[PDB]
Amino acid sequence: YPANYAKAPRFKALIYYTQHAEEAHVQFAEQATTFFKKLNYGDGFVLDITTDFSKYPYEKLKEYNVIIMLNTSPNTKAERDAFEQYMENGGGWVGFHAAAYNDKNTHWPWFVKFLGGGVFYCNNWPPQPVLVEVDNEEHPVTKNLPASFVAPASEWYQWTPSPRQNKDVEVLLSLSPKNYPLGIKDVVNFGDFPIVWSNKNYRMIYLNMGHGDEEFIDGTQNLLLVNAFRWVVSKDKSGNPFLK
Amino acid sequence: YPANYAKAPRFKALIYYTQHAEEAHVQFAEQATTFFKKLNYGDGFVLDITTDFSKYPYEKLKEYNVIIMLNTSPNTKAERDAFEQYMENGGGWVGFHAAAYNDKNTHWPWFVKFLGGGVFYCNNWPPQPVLVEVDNEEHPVTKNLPASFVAPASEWYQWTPSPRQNKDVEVLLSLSPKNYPLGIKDVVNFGDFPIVWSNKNYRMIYLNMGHGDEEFIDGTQNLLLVNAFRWVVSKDKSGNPFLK
Amino acid sequence: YPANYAKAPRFKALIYYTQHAEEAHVQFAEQATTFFKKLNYGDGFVLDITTDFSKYPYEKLKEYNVIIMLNTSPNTKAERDAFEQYMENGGGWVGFHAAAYNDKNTHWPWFVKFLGGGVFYCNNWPPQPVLVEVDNEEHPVTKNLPASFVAPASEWYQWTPSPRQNKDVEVLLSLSPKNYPLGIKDVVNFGDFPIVWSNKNYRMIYLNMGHGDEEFIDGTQNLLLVNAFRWVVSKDKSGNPFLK
Numbered sequence: 001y002p003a004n005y006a007k008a009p010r011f012k013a014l015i016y017y018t019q020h021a022e023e024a025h026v027q028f029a030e031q032a033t034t035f036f037k038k039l040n041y042g043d044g045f046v047l048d049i050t051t052d053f054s055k056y057p058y059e060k061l062k063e064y065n066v067i068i069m070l071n072t073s074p075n076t077k078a079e080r081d082a083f084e085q086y087m088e089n090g091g092g093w094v095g096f097h098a099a100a101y102n103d104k105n106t107h108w109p110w111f112v113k114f115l116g117g118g119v120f121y122c123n124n125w126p127p128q129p130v131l132v133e134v135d136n137e138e139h140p141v142t143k144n145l146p147a148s149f150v151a152p153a154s155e156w157y158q159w160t161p162s163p164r165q166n167k168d169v170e171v172l173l174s175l176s177p178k179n180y181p182l183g184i185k186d187v188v189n190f191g192d193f194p195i196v197w198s199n200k201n202y203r204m205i206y207l208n209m210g211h212g213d214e215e216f217i218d219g220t221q222n223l224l225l226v227n228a229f230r231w232v233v234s235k236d237k238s239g240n241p242f243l244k
Numbered sequence: 245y246p247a248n249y250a251k252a253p254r255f256k257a258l259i260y261y262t263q264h265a266e267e268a269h270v271q272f273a274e275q276a277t278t279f280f281k282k283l284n285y286g287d288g289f290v291l292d293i294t295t296d297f298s299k300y301p302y303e304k305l306k307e308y309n310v311i312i313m314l315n316t317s318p319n320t321k322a323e324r325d326a327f328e329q330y331m332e333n334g335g336g337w338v339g340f341h342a343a344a345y346n347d348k349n350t351h352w353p354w355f356v357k358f359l360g361g362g363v364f365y366c367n368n369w370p371p372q373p374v375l376v377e378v379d380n381e382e383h384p385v386t387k388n389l390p391a392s393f394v395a396p397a398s399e400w401y402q403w404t405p406s407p408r409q410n411k412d413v414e415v416l417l418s419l420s421p422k423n424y425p426l427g428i429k430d431v432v433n434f435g436d437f438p439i440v441w442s443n444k445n446y447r448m449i450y451l452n453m454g455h456g457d458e459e460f461i462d463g464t465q466n467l468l469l470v471n472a473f474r475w476v477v478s479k480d481k482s483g484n485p486f487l488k
Numbered sequence: 489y490p491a492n493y494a495k496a497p498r499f500k501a502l503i504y505y506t507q508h509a510e511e512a513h514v515q516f517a518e519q520a521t522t523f524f525k526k527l528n529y530g531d532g533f534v535l536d537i538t539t540d541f542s543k544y545p546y547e548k549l550k551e552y553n554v555i556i557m558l559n560t561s562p563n564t565k566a567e568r569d570a571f572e573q574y575m576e577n578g579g580g581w582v583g584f585h586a587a588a589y590n591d592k593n594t595h596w597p598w599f600v601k602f603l604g605g606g607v608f609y610c611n612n613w614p615p616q617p618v619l620v621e622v623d624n625e626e627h628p629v630t631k632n633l634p635a636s637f638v639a640p641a642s643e644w645y646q647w648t649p650s651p652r653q654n655k656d657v658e659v660l661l662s663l664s665p666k667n668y669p670l671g672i673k674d675v676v677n678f679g680d681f682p683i684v685w686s687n688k689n690y691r692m693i694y695l696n697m698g699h700g701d702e703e704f705i706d707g708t709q710n711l712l713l714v715n716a717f718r719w720v721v722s723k724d725k726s727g728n729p730f731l732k
């Protein structure tokens with residue numbers, strides 16, 4: 001029989017986002033929360049949602065297979081330390097857009113290293129669709145994606161160093177250099193442009209998109225999101241929940 | 245002159261769907277009805293819509309070039325017998341999603357045979373986009389589609405036997421095995437996965453998608469639907485209405 | 489450093505459309521105006537919007553890098569003459585859909601010549617998605633587009649002569665002949681079918697799509713629009729504003 005029907009929820013996931021962000025980043029979080037809610041129709045998993053990460057010390061995080069951060073990262077020492085302990089003890093992460101933002105004022109070296117080394121460098125403006133290219137066509141995140149496709153509008157970040165420079169990072173999707181020169185207000189002219197990657201030392205994926213209220217208009221990118229979430233969940237060292 | 249402008253409506257079509265179905269299947273029917281209404285702007289055809297197939301014995305069906313079943317099939321003996329006579333006398337059908345659902349309690353062998361032999365076997369859950377592949381790139385349904393593309397979210401059915409096992413069936417679109425393992429709650433791991441086909445003994449096409457309120461977000465799948473409808477309509481043994 | 493961040497708005501653009509048009513052409517204009525408004529978040533450029541082109545003699549047009557005509561062309565002699573002088577003195581144009589419509593009753597030979605020679609010939613009906621093909625994969629308008637893709641629904645125009653017959657026209661995107669026979673009410677069976685082009689004697693692009701309230705459902709076509717606008721703006725003989 002080719003199908004494994006769940007008898008009970010398979011794993012637990014936590015969504016964290018903030019309402020204290022530019023409007024477009026709140027809009028994305030709201031819609032992405034709907035996206036994940038719909039993935040949990042029929043209670044395939046346990047999904048908890050919060051705007052307040054202060055209530056989640058490590059002891060209350062450890063039960064989660066994955067934390068999905070839609071728009072921001074922890075900003076207080078206690079929250080940051082809880083997240084670090086979680087990730088260092090085999091926790092899962094799916095991060096979007098400004099959840100990875102960091103700069104000279106972040107003062108969180110653990111997180112810069114968790115991301116693969118990249119500090120924010122530059123971005124195009126305004127948000128626009130772009131041609132994207134799959135770096136590894138065999139990977140579970142991208143095996144059922146077209147090798148290249150146009151992703152819907154976002155503003156896109158470069159980092160320094162590029163995450164690709166880290167041999168422990170696998171870049172999975174990149175913005176094509178065919179997009180250059182990229183931008184109308186703020187124009188990006190050259191450089192490496194990874195947009196989805198994983199630091200292989202952690203059970204984590206980062207996706208650079210997540211801006212505004214039209215990110216779910218295309219099946220292709222929607223499938224990338226499903227795949228990203230599924231991959232991180234499947235890799236739990238305690239057992240692949242999809243085999244239960 | 246390369247264009248044939250209609251002087252009058254070209255053919256008649258009937259949409260049948262039910263409101264007595266899970267919410268997502270009612271939503272799809274409603275949106276698909278809008279899709280077809282828009283195709284009939286300017287009265288290219290006569291479009292009648294019903295939620296009550298009991299009012300349509302064979303004598304009242306025979307005038308229709310095609311019946312579009314958006315979410316369900318006839319459930320009473322009288323309705324089933326009217327539909328059988330219609331299809332056996334050269335009628336047209338475009339069916340979606342659970343319009344083909346059948347199982348050990350259906351007790352309608354004519355319809356299982358009409359579909360090509362397949363009884364419901366399994367499905368993934370939750371609805372998600374998937375990579376789909378065109379089986380015959382030359383066919384009128386698929387000649388202007390990309391050879392592979394991502395279709396928007398649905399839950400997808402396997403059947404036993406596969407409709408492909410029937411030599412009288414032409415499979416037109418299939419879910420790629422690159423999608424395996426497919427599912428988060430209910431996981432499909434292997435098997436043939438046709439999703440659009442025609443039993444060549446009838447003027448009919450079946451499309452497995454049709455779930456929820458976001459099935460029309462992509463041009464590509466929208467074009468598949470146009471093409472499916474146009475093909476069945478064009479094949480009327482009484483004459484191709486598009487030549488009038 | 490690979491990015492050029494604007495210090496001030498880079499150029500000025502004018503949108504003109506009419507509310508005195510079929511509903512679908514007003515809907516497109518409204519949504520396209522939103523699209524351009526969003527491109528101007530953060531004041532990358534100066535964007536002025538009007539439904540009344542009578543207020544724009546040549547002296548008041550000359551300051552604009554580009555005029556975007558979403559649904560119609562000037563109909564009075566004074567408006568037509570202002571637009572002619574503007575375009576003959578290095579002005580920019582991005583036109584959509586019925587902004588290029590012209591027939592035996594237009595009586596504006598300058599404009600027929602500006603467009604590349606084509607008078608309206610025929611169209612399919614109803615609006616539907618179609619397979620489109622990039623004619624020049626290296627051009628700034630199309631270099632980051634897939635070589636072929638399905639565009640969302642519009643009704644599509646043929647012209648006589650084809651704009652392609654003019655050696656001064658570069659055709660950039662064409663409706664594939666794989667779409668033939670095209671139409672349900674009004675059926676197009678053959679012929680050249682360019683849909684995006686530029687008369688190289690002017691700083692102008694024409695895009696045939698622009699019908700209804702669902703033209704922005706796909707990233708790919710959205711990217712074509714961004715690229716079309718950016719290309720015309722970049723070519724200003726007074727200097728590429730993106731270098732400032």
Ligand SMILES: [Cl-]
Pocket residue numbers: 056057058059078081082085
């Ligand atoms: Cl803690």
Ligand SMILES: [Cl-]
Pocket residue numbers: 128129151152153706707710711
């Ligand atoms: Cl977009």
Ligand SMILES: [Cl-]
Pocket residue numbers: 140227230231234
């Ligand atoms: Cl997976």
Ligand SMILES: [Cl-]
Pocket residue numbers: 300301302303322325326329
């Ligand atoms: Cl009957």
Ligand SMILES: [Cl-]
Pocket residue numbers: 218219222223372373395396397
């Ligand atoms: Cl989807």
Ligand SMILES: [Cl-]
Pocket residue numbers: 384471474475478
């Ligand atoms: Cl056809």
Ligand SMILES: [Cl-]
Pocket residue numbers: 544545546547566569570573
């Ligand atoms: Cl003037």
Ligand SMILES: [Cl-]
Pocket residue numbers: 462463466467616617639640641
């Ligand atoms: Cl469409």
Ligand SMILES: [Cl-]
Pocket residue numbers: 628715718719722
């Ligand atoms: Cl450009």
Ligand SMILES: [Zn+2]
Pocket residue numbers: 019020021
């Ligand atoms: Zn606040």
Ligand SMILES: [Zn+2]
Pocket residue numbers: 104105107
């Ligand atoms: Zn500091």
Ligand SMILES: [Zn+2]
Pocket residue numbers: 107108
């Ligand atoms: Zn510090």
Ligand SMILES: [Zn+2]
Pocket residue numbers: 137138
């Ligand atoms: Zn491969």
Ligand SMILES: [Zn+2]
Pocket residue numbers: 137147
């Ligand atoms: Zn490849």
Ligand SMILES: [Zn+2]
Pocket residue numbers: 167168
């Ligand atoms: Zn290492």
Ligand SMILES: [Zn+2]
Pocket residue numbers: 024025097155210211212
């Ligand atoms: Zn953003």
